[PDB]
């Protein structure tokens with residue numbers, strides 16, 4: 001009767017948000033972005049992307065940690081895998097690069113749950129939680145994982161971003177604010193048994 | 198790197214859809230429905246509901262089995278738990294009542310995965326994949342489970358319903374056609390590794 005995965009959440013006030021050098025995108029525009037996606041596809045095939053969902057609470061309400069690029073777009077911490085790179089080892093690496101500490105102290109990332117899969121059929125924005133009818137060579141595969149945090153940690157946040165804590169209700173049905181992946185996190189996280197430490 | 202649950206899907210042509218006596222709803226209208234929900238709440242508290250997701254394929258495309266009530270509403274097989282009734286034992290019972298055989302041959306239901314949770318804060322239609330801000334006494338809790346089918350089976354379908362197989366793309370972003378629970382099944386099923394037998 002208890003088939004649900006059990007997850008420890010801690011207070012947002014348990015975590016320290018420091019700063020480090022800016023981290024700039026590989027692509028200076030959307031047009032550059034899909035161009036580099038075409039070049040790499042012809043050379044090494046489908047892009048493989050990994051993204052981590054980090055969760056906290058304040059006063060027993062779960063929030064998702066989102067990365068805000070100035071006052072423009074919201075992102076989940078993650079990035080592109082190299083060819084032959086392990087998914088889980090890759091997401092740990094990408095999250096050490098983004099939020100890992102100035103003082104070189106190892107973060108202990110715990111990743112044991114897949115929460116979703118998304119596919120990009122063309123060199124265009126549209127993405128789906130399945131492979132569409134007729135598509136044999138999708139251009140990107142995005143994998144999402146749940147990241148269990150330690151009781152406390154310090155995260156060094158590149159100066160050009162801010163780390164914000166979004167409650168679920170703000171995400172729910174906000175595809176325009178957030179896009180179709182982040183706006184379905186409430187549905188995707190509903191199977192978990194959160195403990196509010 | 199393989200953290201995904203593995204699920205066996207079979208061809209739709211592997212299953213037989215026979216018929217049995219009509220099964221009528223406890224409530225003859227929406228108004229009757231919320232009235233009986235008020236009466237039962239005051240007596241035994243929050244309504245507890247369970248619903249099963251049954252999946253097949255044809256030519257390697259996953260479909261969800263939906264129950265259609267004439268040409269009106271689409272439903273997942275499930276129903277209301279009695280007080281002190283186990284969730285999993287309840288969903289098996291409710292699914293034997295709905296699709297179990299005229300000839301009294303035991304179906305073998307395999308249920309090992311929670312796929313979601315929904316909450317109804319008032320005696321009204323709106324439901325959310327979380328408990329909203331300020332709500333201490335929600336009126337209904339709905340639990341969704343993945344039901345692994347056997348290679349073949351015969352299902353006896355009450356004469357007043359039809360069992361239809363909906364592909365994911367038809368569900369995706371169709372809240373008006375289907376409502377907010379069924380229309381988010383593609384996001385919810387994306388974590389599984391389907392084998393297409």
Ligand SMILES: COC(=O)CNC(=O)c1cc(C)on1
Nearest residue numbers: 023067075076077078079098
């Ligand atoms: C929309 O987000 C993605 O596609 C994956 N995330 C990143 O690339 C990323 C970049 C930085 C900094 O932190 N995460």
Ligand SMILES: COC(=O)CNC(=O)c1cc(C)on1
Nearest residue numbers: 220264272273274275276295
């Ligand atoms: C929208 O569906 C529900 O609330 C749960 N399902 C049923 O009550 C139900 C009734 C019959 C027949 O098969 N399933």
Ligand SMILES: [Zn+2]
Nearest residue numbers: 058059060061
């Ligand atoms: Zn508090």
Ligand SMILES: [Zn+2]
Nearest residue numbers: 046119138141
């Ligand atoms: Zn793929």
Ligand SMILES: [Zn+2]
Nearest residue numbers: 255256257258
């Ligand atoms: Zn085929």
Ligand SMILES: [Zn+2]
Nearest residue numbers: 243316335338
């Ligand atoms: Zn509850």
